[PDB]
Amino acid sequence: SAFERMEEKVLMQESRAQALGELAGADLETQFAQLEGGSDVDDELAALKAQM
Amino acid sequence: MGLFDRIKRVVSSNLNDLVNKAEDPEKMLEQAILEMQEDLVQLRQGVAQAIAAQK
Amino acid sequence: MGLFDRIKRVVSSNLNDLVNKAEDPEKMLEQAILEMQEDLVQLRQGVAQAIAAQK
Amino acid sequence: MGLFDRIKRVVSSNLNDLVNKAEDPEKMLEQAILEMQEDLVQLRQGVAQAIAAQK
Amino acid sequence: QSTQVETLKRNLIQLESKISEAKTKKEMLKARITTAKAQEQLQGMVRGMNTSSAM
Amino acid sequence: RSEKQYNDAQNEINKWQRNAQLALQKGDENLARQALERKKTYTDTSAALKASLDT
Amino acid sequence: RSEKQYNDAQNEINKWQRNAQLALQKGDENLARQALERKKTYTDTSAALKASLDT
């Protein structure tokens, strides 16, 4: 029990620190940036495979 | 008791004018802003707690 | 008796928060593991007794 | 208590302007960077601990 | 007697597995703690909040 | 300085409208909803700030 | 100095792309994945830095 409660406390602390960002409003910026940056690696790998 | 109230009101007026002489708008106008922001900080932390609970 | 219960609940909440302030996850997360292992030791000894009886 | 608060606010404004006079942007702009890097160091150490656990 | 000893040994094996899992989680959460203790020094980097005196 | 702040707010309004364009192109309806919701607040802030820049 | 940093980042982007070439030739898919992942961050950094070099 004293292990589960401590795990919960740590998870809550991390959740608070992280949510302090979505409060800042950077979640939309991150989503938009990752909507373009995510597939670059796969596209480059496919193009390089085609070249080779 | 109808006289000590009057005496204390006179003393309070003396002290309040002695203070209102010292207030200087240039510095007070900035201390007020400082304290307003310092309280906005705590409000932000509260909203953070709420969003963490939702998460 | 409908008031002493309330008083004791208030006192208990005071003490419980005063304690939950002191708990520190870094050390508690290790004390829990220590005690779990310390009990596994006794369980091992019990199984040893059982196997000795079988022998 | 409605007067001591005012007195302490006046004193605080005096001190805060006396300090804000001393701040010099050229040196503060570098102390801020120094402290930011000093904290990034500890964050790096934390990530190191995490990766070691994974290993 | 042998039948019973079999179950006892199986239970001990399960005990050891559970303790191992708990010991892994402890090391994970310790790194989580040491990271979150300074991740605030990322999250203060935004231009809005003043929760990070460094910025 | 006040007019510079006005200009910055006006720029970011159109920035968020364009990002809503991009979301609607490649993303979904919820992302465009969020972008438009932010752009609404930005436009309100810009109008309120110009209201004082005039005086 | 800022433009020199831009140049260095731009150089290392192509360096990592070439090393991904080499990995795909002689190595495996995971090595190329890692190289491309690093090159993505380098390109992002280069673009962000030029965005300020302009001003």
Numbering used by the authors:
A (entry chain A): 166 to 217
B (entry chain A), C (entry chain A), D (entry chain A): 1 to 55
E (entry chain A): 111 to 165
F (entry chain A), G (entry chain A): 56 to 110
What does the paper say about this structure?
The ESCRT-III-like protein Vipp1 couples filament polymerization with membrane remodeling. It assembles planar sheets as well as 3D rings and helical polymers, all implicated in mitigating plastid-associated membrane stress. PspA activity is triggered by agents that threaten inner membrane integrity, including phage, mislocalized secretins, and antibiotics, whereas Vipp1 is a plastid component in cyanobacteria, algae, and plants, in which it functions in thylakoid membrane biogenesis and repair. Given that two-dimensional (2D) planar sheets share a close geometric relationship with helical lattices, and as a means of understanding the interconnectedness of Vipp1 polymers including rings, spirals and planar sheets, we determined the structure of four Vipp1 helical filaments by cryo-EM.
